[PDB]
Design a protein around this ligand. Structure first.
Ligand code: CLA
Ligand code: CLA
Ligand code: CLA
Ligand code: CLA
Ligand code: CLA
Ligand code: CLA
Ligand SMILES: CC(=O)O[C@H]1CC(C)(C)C(=C=C/C(C)=C/C=C/C(C)=C/C=C/C=C(C)/C=C/C=C(\C)C(=O)C[C@@]23O[C@]2(C)C[C@@H](O)CC3(C)C)[C@](C)(O)C1
Ligand SMILES: CC(=O)O[C@H]1CC(C)(C)C(=C=C/C(C)=C/C=C/C(C)=C/C=C/C=C(C)/C=C/C=C(\C)C(=O)C[C@@]23O[C@]2(C)C[C@@H](O)CC3(C)C)[C@](C)(O)C1
Ligand SMILES: CC(=O)O[C@H]1CC(C)(C)C(=C=C/C(C)=C/C=C/C(C)=C/C=C/C=C(C)/C=C/C=C(\C)C(=O)C[C@@]23O[C@]2(C)C[C@@H](O)CC3(C)C)[C@](C)(O)C1
Ligand code: KC2
Ligand SMILES: CC1=C(C#C/C(C)=C/C=C/C(C)=C/C=C/C=C(C)/C=C/C=C(C)/C=C/[C@@]23O[C@]2(C)C[C@@H](O)CC3(C)C)C(C)(C)C[C@H](O)C1
Lengths: 177, 228, 224
């Protein structure tokens, strides 16, 4: 339908060439927006981390399980090599914290996003310091639109990185390693 | 309505021949899509084919005689003298990809409802003018000048002159179709047309496969060529 | 406005008025109305004419002579004037470009230009209005336009005639400077001259070779 998201680069119109609407209800559109926003934020964090690690970056000073003998520098500037070099305990802790946060995101907001509510607004984990606590509602819509466009660009970015890792010389500006 | 317009247009195309539809194509419902939409689709296909045939004829002459644009660009890879079927054989593969992609961009602009309603007109299959290319006042960034009349030579002509121009366009398009396929037929089977026997050499590749002889991966770019 | 440009072109040349094959008087490539595009195009034309005529005079002056102030002869002995510009010190080119940028940011700023009594050229200002330099507490002896006066008693019709003459002079001088640069780079381009010679390197490049800079001076892999 109308929703957020639509702006320029499409002329103010909904971009939907093949299907995916007229078969969707309000609940299905709410889920579409929630999935889009979660993919948006995850991909934004993913491109930021890949760009800070693989390109340059002062890198985290420390040990990262000194008991196992791993160091932060030992993971390497490659990413799939570094993620595989993160200890299994560290992987499990990251995945468990993410799962706890999302189970509480599902169970903590009382108007669920598919039972009313606003998709993409999760309890906790947003602004702890209240930077966006004084913005006007008209300014908030612009920032939500910027978030959506940002996340679409970041999704394209992450899949460019993954495609160039698995298939070399794809994404032509991106190098072969 | 559409059929009577076909009869009239065929009368002014050739009064001696007139309406020549042996294979009844102005009566087949293609996608269960009425009569007028089928007529508009057929006219649009005829006009597009004719325009592409005219441009291809002129380009075939330019390539076979040897008409390179200049330096640094993709003409540097094509050898000096290769006949017209081989200039789409030695340009880079990405050059072919981006040429066909820009042609597809033009097709999409030609049938985009947002580009088409910006000019106040409808689809050719929904009661529009067949073969009409829209303006560019829907892009997102302003285009310097449109595709049909790049300069303002047109737009002062009478509608009768425009109709005569359309009839001449269709007739010249059909004749260019015949000429270009005479070229392509001589390039495959010898002695197909009598006049071009010995003029156009034989070709071995497939004319319907855009990327069967894939071009080289040569990256003709200097200054900031960070993509290898 | 749209109609004023044909009148100005007819005043510039009565035989050929309003010559735009590329149209360009309706492309709203800033999204700020038709008047903004006309003002930008007029200001760009006038700026290019002034810079091109000054560059033609400078090329004529520096192709034969130099300035005897402080060892400005080894740089003048570097063949073509463009190679002399590429052989100048890095601080020299940096300060020259920053000086021109300071003049540009002073002229375009629509608060100092409002102190002179006009507005920005995209908002109704005249095309080409490098204003009086009275905005900061640092007493300047002379301004940019009309430094040693001698133009206070000029009439409005004389001002319009001079503006048209300057526009046409820059219209010729842009082609003249372009032909000089083309003959410097590719010999045989200018068929009416065969005296100017020597390479310019990359003519559209301010920094070259001896310019160290914080990286990004990748002069390798040049083009034609
Ligand atoms: C999986 C991520 C995802 C999701 C769930 C959505 C969801 C949505 N987008 Mg969206 N979008 C995305 C990614 C995503 N987008 C990306 C990456 C881009 C940049 C190209 C865009 C650009 C975009 C525009 C420009 C617009 C939308 C709009 C919409 C809404 C309506 C469209 C619809 O019904 O389809 C929802 C259902 C799906 C997207 C299911 C996906 C279908 C298949 C599985 C995807 C296959 C694609 C293919 C694998 C991609 C190749 C890889 C790629 C890197 C090239 C909806 C909320 C419109 C809107 O906001 O209207 C209100 C709108 O105008 N999107
Ligand atoms: C692909 C190109 C193309 C397209 C889409 C059309 C489309 C059309 N033509 Mg047209 N035409 C063409 C090329 C084309 N023409 C050429 C090259 C000539 C010159 C010979 C003409 C001469 C012509 C006349 C004189 C008239 C039309 C007319 C028409 C219209 C309806 C009549 C009809 O059945 O269609 C045309 C039929 C087809 C395109 C058949 C489809 C292709 C088949 C399936 C393949 C056949 C291949 C086969 C090997 C050919 C054997 C040739 C030989 C052995 C006999 C329609 C808009 C009529 C009109 O004015 O309406 C506007 C009309 O009176 N055509
Ligand atoms: C014998 C039957 C017949 C009849 C009655 C017509 C009648 C007509 N034809 Mg036609 N035509 C015929 C057979 C016929 N044609 C055949 C067999 C062909 C295939 C070769 C054509 C190909 C043809 C084309 C391609 C066009 C016409 C056009 C026309 C119309 C106007 C032409 C005009 O006034 O100035 C034209 C008179 C000239 C002398 C043309 C000037 C010379 C050209 C521009 C240069 C070509 C030189 C070139 C190097 C030669 C090689 C007119 C109704 C035109 C049209 O639709 O207009 C409404 C049009 O564009 N016809
Ligand atoms: C980059 C330089 C530049 C720019 C921005 C413009 C800009 C413009 N020119 Mg212009 N012009 C230029 C160089 C330039 N000109 C040169 C070098 C020539 C001589 C070959 C001309 C010859 C020219 C003519 C003959 C006319 C313009 C006109 C115009 C206006 C449309 C617009 C203000 C038109 C106008 O005055 O309006 C017009 O009639 N120009
Ligand atoms: C720090 C350097 C700097 C900066 C910020 C600008 C800034 C600008 N220049 Mg500019 N310019 C510079 C140096 C600079 N210039 C130098 C060194 C030259 C060569 C003498 C020029 C020649 C130049 C021309 C010829 C034009 C500009 C134009 C412009 C404007 C676009 C903008 C205000 C354009 C403009 O104002 O058009 C309206 C324009 O036409 N500049
Ligand atoms: C008096 C006008 C005039 C004439 C007769 C020519 C004549 C020629 N030019 Mg030329 N040219 C001119 C003005 C002129 N140019 C101006 C003003 C410029 C600068 C914009 C150029 C820039 C130019 C280039 C860049 C090139 C030519 C080239 C050529 C030759 C083809 C031919 C001898 C070409 C040539 O032979 O160079 C090797 C070529 O590459 N010209
Ligand atoms: C608006 C929008 O969004 O869409 C809407 C509208 C629309 C489109 C109408 C909708 C629908 C309906 C849909 C999508 C229907 C889809 C139907 C579908 C997808 C049907 C696949 C059949 C494949 C078969 C039978 C394969 C057999 C293959 C067999 C039996 C083989 O042996 C395979 C074989 O390989 C082996 C194993 C070995 C080899 O020796 C090779 C072969 C090949 C022999 C939806 C869902 O309502 C959504
Ligand atoms: C026995 C035997 O073998 O015989 C042989 C002989 C021979 C010669 C070998 C053979 C051949 C080849 C042939 C006949 C090839 C024909 C090719 C053909 C017929 C090619 C049309 C091009 C038209 C163009 C490019 C239109 C441009 C149109 C343009 C540029 C415009 O739109 C401009 C314009 O519209 C505006 C914008 C406004 C108008 O107011 C004014 C004009 C109109 C100027 C054959 C068929 O094999 C048979
Ligand atoms: C009444 C009043 O207030 O005072 C008056 C007078 C006064 C004091 C002077 C004024 C002033 C200020 C100044 C400083 C005015 C001077 C301005 C200046 C310096 C104007 C340079 C133009 C350069 C041109 C046209 C170059 C053309 C160049 C051309 C045409 C070419 O090169 C073409 C050519 O190369 C080809 C393409 C091939 C060659 O083979 C042949 C040639 C060479 C022909 C005022 C204030 O403005 C008005
Ligand atoms: C490969 C490119 C190409 C070629 C070789 C070519 C040849 C000729 C010839 C010579 C044989 C004539 C005489 C002619 C004349 C007209 N052309 Mg064509 N034309 C080409 C491209 C386009 C496009 C893109 C458009 C277009 C149109 C028109 C209209 C306007 C009719 C109207 O305004 O009623 C007239 C009179 C516009 C349109 O409206 O088509 C329905 C349109 O958008 N043309 N055209
Ligand atoms: C080097 C560098 C980088 C870079 C870069 C960049 C920006 C590279 C950019 C390359 C780029 C920008 C290449 C464009 C080609 C455009 C073409 C070929 C258009 C042809 C257009 C044509 C032929 C249009 C024709 C017509 O329009 C006409 C004239 C009239 C209309 O009626 C009809 C049509 C529309 C058909 C990094 C790596 C990103 C960062 C680094 O720091 C510095």
């Amino acid at each position: 339908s109308d929703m957020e998201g639509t702006g320029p680069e499409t002329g103010g119109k909904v971009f939907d060439p093949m299907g995916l609407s007229k078969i969707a209800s309000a609940e299905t559109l709410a889920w579409y927006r929630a999935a889009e926003l979660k993919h948006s934020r995850v991909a934004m964090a993913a491109v930021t981390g890949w760009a800070w690690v693989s390109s340059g970056g002062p890198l985290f000073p420390g040990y990262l399980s000194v008991e196992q003998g791993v160091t932060f520098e030992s993971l390497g500037r490659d990413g799939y090599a570094a993620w595989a070099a993160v200890p299994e305990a560290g992987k499990f802790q990251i995945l468990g914290v993410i799962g706890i946060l999302e189970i509480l995101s599902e169970s903590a907001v009382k108007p669920h996003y598919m039972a009313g509510g606003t998709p993409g607004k999760v309890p906790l984990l947003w602004d702890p310091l209240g930077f966006t606590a004084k913005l006007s509602p008209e300014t908030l819509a612009r920032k939500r639109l910027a978030e959506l466009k940002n996340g679409r660009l970041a999704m394209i970015g992450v899949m460019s990185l993954v495609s160039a890792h698995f298939i070399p010389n794809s994404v032509p500006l991106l190098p072969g390693s | 309505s559409a059929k009577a317009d076909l009869e009239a247009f065929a009368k002014e195309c050739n009064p001696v021949v007139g309406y020549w539809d042996p294979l009844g194509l102005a009566d087949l419902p293609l996608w269960g899509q009425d009569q007028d939409a089928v007529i508009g689709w057929l006219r649009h296909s005829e006009i597009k084919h004719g325009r592409i045939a005219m441009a291809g004829f002129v380009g075939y002459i330019a390539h076979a005689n040897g008409f390179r644009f200049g330096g640094i660009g993709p003409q540097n890879v094509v050898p000096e003298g290769a006949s017209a079927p081989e200039v789409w054989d030695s340009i880079p593969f990405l050059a072919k990809l981006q040429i066909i992609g820009a042609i597809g961009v033009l097709e999409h602009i030609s049938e985009d409802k947002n580009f088409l309603a910006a000019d106040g007109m409808k689809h050719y299959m929904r009661g529009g003018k067949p073969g009409y290319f829209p303006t560019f006042s829907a892009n997102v960034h302003p285009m310097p000048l449109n595709l049909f009349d790049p300069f303002k030579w047109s737009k002062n002509a009478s509608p009768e002159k425009k109709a005569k121009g359309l009839v001449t366009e269709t007739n010249n398009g059909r004749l260019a179709m015949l000429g270009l396929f005479g070229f392509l037929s001589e390039s495959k089977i010898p002695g197909s047309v009598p006049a071009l026997s010995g003029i156009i050499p034989s070709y071995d590749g497939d004319y319907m496969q855009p990327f069967l002889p894939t071009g080289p991966d040569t990256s003709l770019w200097t200054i900031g060529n960070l993509w290898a | 406005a749209m109609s004023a440009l044909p009148e100005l072109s007819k005043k510039l040349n009565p035989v050929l008025g309003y010559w735009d094959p590329l149209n360009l008087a309706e492309l709203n490539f800033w999204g700020a109305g038709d008047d903004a595009t006309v003002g930008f195009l007029r200001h760009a034309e006038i700026k290019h004419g002034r810079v091109a005529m000054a560059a033609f005079v400078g090329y004529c002056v520096q192709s034969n002579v130099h300035f005897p102030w402080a060892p400005f002869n080894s740089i003048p002995t570097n063949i073509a004037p463009a190679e002399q510009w590429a052989q100048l010190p890095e601080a020299a080119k940096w300060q020259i470009i920053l000086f021109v940028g300071f003049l540009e940011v002073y002229s375009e700023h629509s608060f100092i230009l409002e102190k002179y009594g006009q507005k920005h050229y995209m908002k109704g200002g005249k095309p080409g209005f490098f204003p009086d330099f009275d905005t900061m507490v640092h007493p300047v002896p002379l301004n940019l336009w009309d430094p040693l006066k001698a133009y206070k008693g000029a009439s409005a019709e004389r001002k319009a005639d001079g503006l048209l003459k300057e526009v046409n002079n820059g219209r010729l001088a842009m082609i003249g400077i372009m032909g000089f640069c083309a003959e410097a780079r590719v010999p045989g381009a200018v068929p009416a001259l065969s005296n100017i010679a020597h390479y310019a390197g990359d003519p559209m490049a301010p920094f070259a070779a001896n310019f160290h800079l914080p990286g990004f001076a990748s002069x390798x892999x040049x083009x034609x």
